Amino acid sequence: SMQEEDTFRELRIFLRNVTHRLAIDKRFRVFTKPVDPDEVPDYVTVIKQPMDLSSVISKIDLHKYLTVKDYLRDIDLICSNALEYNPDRDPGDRLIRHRACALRDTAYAIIKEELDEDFEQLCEEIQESR
Numbered sequence: 686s687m688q689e690e691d692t693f694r695e696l697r698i699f700l701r702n703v704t705h706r707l708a709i710d711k712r713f714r715v716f717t718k719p720v721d722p723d724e725v726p727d728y729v730t731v732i733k734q735p736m737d738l739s740s741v742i743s744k745i746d747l748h749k750y751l752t753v754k755d756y757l758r759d760i761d762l763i764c765s766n767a768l769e770y771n772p773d774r775d776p777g778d779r780l781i782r783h784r785a786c787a788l789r790d791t792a793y794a795i796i797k798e799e800l801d802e803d804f805e806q807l808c809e810e811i812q813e814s815r
């Protein structure tokens with residue numbers, strides 16, 4: 686229905702805004718674009734499902750997220766990929782893991798404060814009906 690399409694458009698607007706706020710945070714610069722294979726040649730071999738905030742925006746725009754839960758799975762993926770690819774005690778790895786955890790926690794915190802639970806429940810119910 687057109688009311689349903691209006692719901693999903695509102696979702697997309699909300700998600701772009703959260704994603705923009707994450708993307709402009711200097712701590713998260715490393716997560717804003719896909720990994721450069723020149724710079725990191727084995728990345729695309731080790732990490733099976735690369736994700737980054739530019740790709741998140743492309744997916745919002747492609748109507749691939751019908752719920753905040755689906756969006757959060759991709760935020761989670763950005764984080765788990767970083768924990769998997771940089772697991773060492775070395776300070777570079779530890780820095781990127783900290784930042785990955787901060788990205789995830791920040792996204793969850795924004796969503797906890799700003800997403801109405803009934804809005805999300807509506808999205809989920811429309812999704813389940815299709």
Ligand SMILES: Cc1c[nH]c(=O)[nH]c1=O
Nearest residue numbers: 715720725766767770771
């Ligand atoms: C996204 C990313 C970039 N560079 C790295 O060394 N590791 C990563 O996980």
